[PDB]
């Protein structure tokens, strides 16, 4: 029962594409495996993803974030087309991870960009993510309980020097 237009992908086709794309662009497959179930609806034979409204596809991108990646030179279709597609959305998730990793490491020198921190950056955007890490307050607080748990864990990991 889920706590309260779609496209459906099978687990196999998502897995195959993740395996291929993650290898090609140097983003861990485990990050995709972490993020996809948080952002989308898990069903028996795969995942369903919302492709209407402001946030769309497996990465739940908005147009501004998607276009930000294109501005960096990433080869993506237009937001409205790519966000409904398997491969383009997976590339975008990964490209965004790579850019957010750079942003995190530049502001918090000597710190490690973990999956939950990467998800926080994905969820809030890099500016607001850094603001949450410093202030403890989300700029965009209207998130799911799973998203909130993930970003809380992210801040915990950020602050603490080591596993413990
Ligand atoms: N996942 C992106 C998080 C995000 C990024 C930007 C905004 S907005 O201020 O431009 F409406 C809102 C939410």
Residue numbers in the entry: 48 to 51, 61 to 220
Q: What text does the study give?
A:
To understand the molecular basis of the thermostabilization of P5 by the V207F mutation we determined the crystal structures of P5ΔV8wt and P5ΔV8V207F at 1.4 Å resolution (we could not obtain crystals of P5wt or P5V207F). The structures of P5ΔV8wt and P5ΔV8V207F are almost identical, with a root mean square deviation (rmsd) of the Cα positions of 0.135 Å. Residue 207 is located on helix α8, facing the hydrophobic core of the protein. The lack of electron density within the cavity suggests that it is unoccupied. We note that P5ΔV8 forms an unusual crystal-packing interaction in which three N-terminal residues (residues 48–50) of one of the two subunits in the asymmetric unit insert into a shallow groove in a molecule in the adjacent asymmetric unit. Given that residues 48–50 make specific crystal contacts it was surprising that residues 53–59 were disordered and only residues 48–52 and 60–220 could be modeled. We will refer to the largest fragment, residues 48–220, as P5ΔV8.
Lysins are lytic proteins that locally degrade the cell wall, either to provide access to the inner bacterial membrane during infection or to release virus progeny by cell lysis. However, in LTs, there is only one acidic residue, typically a glutamic acid, in the vicinity of the substrate cleavage site. Φ6 P5 adopts a lysozyme superfamily fold and our structure of P5 bound to a tetrasaccharide substrate analog shows that the enzyme contains a single glutamate (Glu95) in its active site.
